[PDB]
Amino acid sequence: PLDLALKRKYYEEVRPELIRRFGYQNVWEVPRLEKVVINQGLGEAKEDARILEKAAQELALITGQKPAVTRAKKSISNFKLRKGMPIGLRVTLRRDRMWIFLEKLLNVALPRIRDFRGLNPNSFDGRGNYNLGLREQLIFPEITYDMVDALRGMDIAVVTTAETDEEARALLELLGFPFRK
């Protein structure tokens, strides 16, 4: 379904807007999203995959994609780790799914967040990319209360083509990133 609200926002408003502050000589120099990634540090449930099939299908609902497990590399008995028996979930959503996802998060997820106040602006890692954590996961649409057996939040990475994050700072605000400023 190559169409949606935010998908347009970037073109018929946000694309030229960027050219206003930086004036790119070329049509591609103008930064774009192209990679949204999500990861859950469930080393907590690394014991039994029992409490894991759930957070997977839960994650799948809110993202549309079928998540992919991530094994342990090292081994640390300091907290029950060895080989690859452990666990973590990772899902790389791009294309349309990325937009239909970012619409929910910026227009539904964030606002219903317990005592929200604005995304931390410092979370820009030199190059144009943003990261942020969420203690809960029920702050998503298609998640009912009686469904969650345990509150397990996570964090999402978003990747732009922006070289410097100075530019990136702008591209996010223009899409709908409520920065704490």
Partner: peptide, 30 residues
């Protein structure tokens, strides 16, 4: 499949995700 998000304050959003029913309470328009 398409779905309608009935915000807790008008602004019935519409996008794509399983289960069209959406009792969203409050949103970005508040």
């Amino acid at each position: 499949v398409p779905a309608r998000i009935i915000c807790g304050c008008g602004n019935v959003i519409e996008t794509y995700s399983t289960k069209p029913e959406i009792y969203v309470e409050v949103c970005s328009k508040c």
